[PDB]
Design a protein around this ligand. Structure first.
Ligand code: GNP
Ligand code: GDP
Length: 414
């Protein structure tokens, strides 16, 4: 049989609202991310859609038809069980997509991505352009561009758009990003895309020795009304593990931790607890490595997690040595101009004393610029951030319009 393992890679599906995301993830996993089917034990997030599936391959059959997401090769001859390759995950935003602190969270999480393009829409729609830059900012490594709705246009028209795309990434990092044409609605050429993600979005190297770090993006009080006091469960923490691994029964801590305001002065003292359980989807595990969205059971007073109280925090082992700074130094790189409302907009260089919004992992706090230089700036922060590794990508954003907007990215230096 195939093994009941956990996902080992996260793929985010980004698509201009109405190009195919929700349906495309379904054509692959067989699940509908956005609005869906179970909560009694089905993995949930702050708001974003999420789905997982196994990936296999039939040894006898030819490709791409040989890739399967289920343990069967009948579809092409064999009564033989196909070869398992890996279990994967998909994340996307329900009938929408950026939401501004969401696209920033899903960044330290995404291992690769998929840009959905409607084949019956002139390329590139505005929202696609910004998705495109957002991905560059985010540092999206492995990318695949999917030409959706290809079944509603002619081969020639599809080809026409194909070129437009190829000659839009003609001079960017996307230079070679593959373009795969499909129909998520009617499921057409879906097998090629699965080949395409097996080739272009490979599972990243995993140094299992690195110190464990998980980004918290969800947390709650699982207890239902009526629960008896001696029978209630500890708080629960949903997040994605970035590096290392966590095991049930390990002592851990939450950073920055608990916000305490003694003497009218704010300050955060880390929150300690132990892992009571690890769950991926609806199945329990012993350990939790990077890949997929994991649910961690603790021994925390439900008041602590209740209603995503711990969102933006990170979990590490109790003795892990992780700074928690209220002032950080960032080696940055801005954008020349941002996708403005009308047509464009030019970004002003970082001016001192102006308030910005940085993203660190699943964190997003506002800070005041205290220092500003060619390649570096320093900022005071409203709330502190845990810095588990040296250079951790950060996303600088400015309330350009009336709405915050990415204006560059940088590395947190310590
Ligand atoms: N690791 C782990 N995860 C669990 C356990 N029990 C439940 N979960 C997680 O809890 C999730 C569902 O949470 P949910 O019941 O919707 O929280 P809630 O009851 O809406 N919080 P509230 O009652 O304040 O509205 C599932 O996706 C599942 O993974 C457990 O014992 N261990
Ligand atoms: N013809 C065609 N229609 C599609 C395809 N994928 C999705 N659709 C249509 O678009 C709708 C879903 O749009 P949706 O995926 O929710 O937009 P999103 O939430 O931004 O991803 C469905 O009602 C489908 O009828 C496709 O591959 N081909």
């Amino acid at each position: 049989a195939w093994p009941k393992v956990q996902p080992e890679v996260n793929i985010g599906v980004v698509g201009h609202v109405d190009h195919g995301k929700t349906t495309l993830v379904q054509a692959i996993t067989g699940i509908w991310t956005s609005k869906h089917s179970e909560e009694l034990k089905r993995g949930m997030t702050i708001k974003l859609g999420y789905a997982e599936t196994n990936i296999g391959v039939c040894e006898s059959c030819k490709k791409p038809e040989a890739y399967v997401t289920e343990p069967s090769c009948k579809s092409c001859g064999s009564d033989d069980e196909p070869k398992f390759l890996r279990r994967i995950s998909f994340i996307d935003a329900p009938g929408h997509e950026v939401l501004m602190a969401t696209m920033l969270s899903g960044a330290a999480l995404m291992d690769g991505a998929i840009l959905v393009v409607a084949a019956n829409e002139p390329f590139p729609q505005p929202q696609t352009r910004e998705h495109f830059v957002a991905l560059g900012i985010i540092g999206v490594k492995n990318l695949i561009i999917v030409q959706n709705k290809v079944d509603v246009v002619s081969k020639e028209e599809a080809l026409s758009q194909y070129r437009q795309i190829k000659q839009f990434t003609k001079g960017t990092w996307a230079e070679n990003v593959p373009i795969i044409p499909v129909s998520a609605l009617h499921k057409i050429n879906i097998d090629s895309l699965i080949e395409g993600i097996e080739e272009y979005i490979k599972t990243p190297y995993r140094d299992l020795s690195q110190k464990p770090v998980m980004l918290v993006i969800r947390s709650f009080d699982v207890n239902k009304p009526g629960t008896q006091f001696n029978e209630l469960k500890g708080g629960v923490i949903g997040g994605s593990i970035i590096q290392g691994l966590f095991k049930v029964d390990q002592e851990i801590k939450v950073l920055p931790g608990l916000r305490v305001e003694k003497q009218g002065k704010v300050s955060y003292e880390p929150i300690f607890t132990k892992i009571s359980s690890i769950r991926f989807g609806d199945e329990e595990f012993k350990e939790a490595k990077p890949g997929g969205l994991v649910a961690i059971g603790t021994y925390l007073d439900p008041s602590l997690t209740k209603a995503d109280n711990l969102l933006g925090s990170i979990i590490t082992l109790a003795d892990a040595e992780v700074p928690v700074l209220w002032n950080i130094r960032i080696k940055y790189n801005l954008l020349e101009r941002v996708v403005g409302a009308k047509e464009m907009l030019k970004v002003d260089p970082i001016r001192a004393k102006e308030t910005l919004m940085l993203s660190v992992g699943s964190s997003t706090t506002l800070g005041i610029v205290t220092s500003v230089k060619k390649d570096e700036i320093e900022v005071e922060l409203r709330r502190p951030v845990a810095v588990w590794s040296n250079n951790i990508r950060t996303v600088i954003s400015r309330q350009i319009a009336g709405r915050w907007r990415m204006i560059g990215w940088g590395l947190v230096e310590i």
